[PDB]
Design a protein around this ligand. Structure first.
Ligand SMILES: Cc1cccc(Nc2ncc(-c3cccnc3)c3cccnc23)n1
Ligand SMILES: [Mg+2]
Ligand SMILES: [Zn+2]
Length: 313
C-alpha cells in the first residue's frame, strides 16, 4: 500500500520529458511502467501483485523481433504517460488506466510482419480478421492475459466501468492500424478547423484517443537524433526480412522492404515524416497544445534526415 516505485534521480527527472529513452536495462522496464501507472493513475488503481503478474505475462507474449518487441511496448506506454501528465484534467480516471495498459499491450505477439504480408502468405489470422489483422490479434491476446487467474487488474472496477475500459483498450489498439490513421486524422483536421470538435462527444474522444495512439506508436521519430537513427535500423531489419519473405512468395516487395534498395532509405524517411509523422503530431498539437514538444522533436529529426541526403552525414 505505502510502497512507491522510485527511479534514480536522472530517470526520475527525464521520464517526465517526451524524448525519454527507457534505456538498455530490460529488468528496469517493468518498474518504469509501474512508476508511470502510480504517478499517472494512482498507487491504488491496480493491486500491485496483479499488476506485476499482468506486466510479466505481457512481456512473455512479446517476441524476440528487432523492433515490435517488449522495449517498443514500454516506449509507447511512456509516450502515452507524457501526453496524459501534460493534459492532467482532460482524461477520466478510466481513460488513464485503460490507455497505459492499451499501449503496453498494443503489439502483443507481433511476428515482425505487416498485415499485407499475412494476407499474401494466407496466414490463418488473415482468415480470422480480414482488416486490422494483427491489431485484432493484439486485442485478443490482451483479453486472454486479463483472463489468466490472478491477472485481472480491472477486478475492482464495477461491471459497467469494466465494459467501458475494455472498449477504450479495444478502440485504442485497433487505432494503431496505420491504414486507419489517414482517415482518422483528416476527420480530426476538418472538425478542429470548422470548430465542430467536442471532447464531450464520445465519437470525437474516440478519434482523439486514436490519434494519441498513432502519436505514441510512432514516438521513435520524436527522440533525440541518435535514438531515432539507431531505432530506424531495428524497424528496417524487420522491413527487409519481410521483403525477403515477399521474394520467397515470388513477389517483388515495395522498395521500403527491399534490402537491395538500402540507398533509398533516407528519401523513404522524408516521405514517412511528410506523409505520416509531421501531420500526426501537427493535428495532435492543435487538439492538445502541451504535446507540441513531440512535433518540435519530429521536425528536428526530419531536418537530420535531410542532412543525411545532402551527404552532411
Ligand atoms: C511510407 C513509409 C516509407 C518508409 C518507411 C515507413 N515506415 C516507417 N519508417 C520508419 C519508422 C521509424 C521507426 C523508428 C525510428 N525512426 C523511424 C517507422 C515506425 C513505425 C512505423 N513505420 C515506420 N513508411
Ligand atoms: Mg502494431
Ligand atoms: Zn506499435
Amino acid at each position: 500500500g505505502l510502497m512507491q516505485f522510485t527511479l534514480p534521480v536522472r530517470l526520475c527527472k527525464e521520464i517526465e520529458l517526451f524524448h525519454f529513452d527507457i534505456g538498455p536495462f530490460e529488468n528496469m522496464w517493468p518498474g518504469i511502467f509501474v512508476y508511470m501507472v502510480h504517478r499517472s493513475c494512482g498507487t491504488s488503481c491496480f493491486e500491485l501483485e496483479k499488476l506485476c503478474r499482468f506486466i510479466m505475462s505481457v512481456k512473455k507474449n512479446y517476441r524476440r523481433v528487432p523492433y515490435h518487441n517488449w522495449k517498443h511496448a514500454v516506449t509507447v506506454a511512456h509516450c502515452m504517460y507524457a501526453i496524459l501528465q501534460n493534459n492532467h484534467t482532460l482524461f477520466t480516471d478510466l481513460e488513464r488506466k485503460g490507455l497505459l495498459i492499451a499501449c503496453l499491450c498494443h503489439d502483443l505477439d507481433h511476428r515482425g510482419f505487416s498485415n499485407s504480408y499475412l494476407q499474401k502468405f494466407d496466414h490463418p489470422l488473415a482468415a480470422l480478421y480480414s482488416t486490422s489483422t494483427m491489431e485484432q490479434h493484439h486485442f485478443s491476446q490482451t483479453v486472454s492475459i486479463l483472463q489468466l487467474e490472478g491477472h485481472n487488474i480491472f477486478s475492482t472496477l464495477s461491471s459497467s466501468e469494466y465494459e467501458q475500459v475494455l472498449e477504450i483498450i479495444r478502440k485504442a489498439i485497433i487505432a494503431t492500424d496505420l491504414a486507419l490513421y489517414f482517415g482518422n486524422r483528416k476527420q480530426l483536421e476538418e472538425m478542429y478547423q470548422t470548430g465542430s470538435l467536442n471532447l464531450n462527444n464520445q465519437s470525437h474522444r474516440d478519434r482523439v484517443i486514436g490519434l494519441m495512439m498513432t502519436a505514441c506508436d510512432l514516438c521513435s521519430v520524436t527522440k533525440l537524433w541518435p535514438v531515432t537513427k539507431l531505432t530506424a535500423n531495428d524497424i528496417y531489419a524487420e522491413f527487409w526480412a519481410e521483403g525477403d519473405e515477399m521474394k520467397k512468395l515470388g513477389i517483388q516487395p515495395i522498395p521500403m522492404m527491399d534490402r537491395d534498395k538500402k540507398d533509398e532509405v533516407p528519401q523513404g524517411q522524408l516521405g514517412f515524416y511528410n506523409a505520416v509523422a509531421i501531420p500526426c503530431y501537427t493535428t495532435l498539437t492543435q487538439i492538445l497544445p502541451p504535446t507540441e514538444p513531440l512535433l518540435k522533436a519530429c521536425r528536428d529529426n526530419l531536418s537530420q534526415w535531410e542532412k543525411v541526403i545532402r551527404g552532411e552525414e
